[PDB]
């Protein structure tokens, strides 16, 4: 059955993939309000679309900084992929455009803030709470992988909580459409699969490992592999050892042993039954996947809010006036954007 749902999804996706939307708005159509988060070559700002009054989250990338960091192709990937996908737990890309200086991607604003903030503040989630979120990541990866996409940057910092307390995955900077295998060393140290660190060549199995890290971090309050130095983190990841808090249920430990499996030939989500080995695990036995997909399950908590455009669930960041050069930068490099 789900076989059928994905089939139809892929046709919709493929059409947009081959004929992407381009230049669907202009900077002056948006009122810029406040920075919601930052990256090495840009920022995301809360904006208000003037003609409709809708609030959006507008990612602003400096073309010159994208080039210096060798992220041209990754950025083209991000935008091409994001304009073609459609899933309840994936943030929507509403418009994209560019000007002399920047690339712009206007996405839905998710007012609940990052899972990261909530997790650090409360310490750790209960198992039911973690499970509810993990289920949404399982369904989202199921969708994304059926499209030959790898996500490649799962972590709490990249998951937003919506007004219903459900997850919205954002940050498709490393997403890629690949059949077979890829080699780029990218991701976030705590979340890297052993095969990335080992320069092995890798595939969608790395997303399932990262799901292992995420669930662990959500339930424990810290990740399974951490140190002051990335190199010491890498050594722990490839050591093939992991320890669980004593409050982890036996089912949770069993699940995580199978996700944080250093051996591709043994990792859940990478065997014959694919994602169904995860969906059918006892830890998920209480999970009604259809109810989750349909947003019929009561969330562990709803973010607090006061009036639209309220940002209390996001940290404050240093603000920086936008400047658009009188000269076009890196035209050819971003032609297709």
């Amino acid at each position: 059955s789900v076989k059928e749902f994905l089939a139809k999804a892929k046709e919709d996706f493929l059409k947009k993939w081959e004929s992407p939307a381009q230049n669907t708005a202009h900077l002056d159509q948006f009122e810029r309000i406040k920075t919601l988060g930052t990256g090495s070559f840009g920022r995301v700002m809360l904006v208000k679309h003037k003609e409709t009054g809708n609030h959006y989250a507008m990612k602003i990338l400096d073309k010159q900084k994208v080039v210096k960091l060798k992220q041209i192709e990754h950025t083209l990937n991000e935008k091409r992929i994001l304009q073609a996908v459609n899933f309840p737990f994936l943030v929507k890309l509403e418009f994209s455009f560019k000007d002399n200086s920047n690339l712009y991607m206007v996405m839905e604003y998710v007012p609940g803030g990052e899972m990261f903030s909530h997790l650090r503040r409360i310490g750790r989630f209960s198992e039911p709470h973690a499970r509810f979120y993990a289920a949404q990541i399982v369904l989202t990866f199921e969708y994304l992988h059926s499209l030959d996409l790898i996500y490649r940057d799962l972590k709490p910092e990249n998951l937003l909580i919506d007004q219903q307390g459900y997850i919205q995955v954002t940050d498709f900077g490393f997403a890629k459409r690949v059949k077979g295998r890829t080699w780029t060393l990218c991701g976030t140290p705590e979340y890297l699969a052993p095969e990335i660190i080992l320069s092995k060549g890798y595939n969608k199995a790395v997303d399932w490992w990262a799901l292992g890290v995420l669930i662990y971090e959500m339930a424990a309050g810290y990740p399974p592999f951490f140190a002051d130095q990335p190199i010491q983190i890498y050594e722990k990841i490839v050591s093939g050892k992991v320890r669980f808090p004593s409050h982890f249920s036996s089912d949770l430990k069993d699940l995580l042993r199978n996700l944080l499996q250093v051996d591709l030939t043994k990792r859940f989500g990478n065997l014959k039954n694919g994602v169904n080995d995860i969906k059918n695990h006892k830890w998920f036995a209480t999970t009604d996947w259809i109810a989750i997909y349909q947003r019929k399950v009561e969330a562990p908590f709803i973010p607090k809010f006061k009036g639209p455009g309220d940002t209390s669930n996001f940290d404050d960041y240093e603000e920086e006036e936008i400047r658009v050069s009188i000269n076009e930068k890196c035209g050819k490099e971003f032609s297709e954007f």
């Binding site: 060798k70 991701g187 976030t188 140290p189 309050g221 951490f226 002051d228």
Partner: peptide
């Protein structure tokens, strides 16, 4: 405790991606 060691580590803030 493992939790105390995490909180006292340099990696409890937002984590940057690596690119290269």
């Amino acid at each position: 405790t493992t939790y105390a060691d995490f909180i006292a580590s340099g990696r409890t803030g937002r984590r940057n991606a690596i690119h290269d």
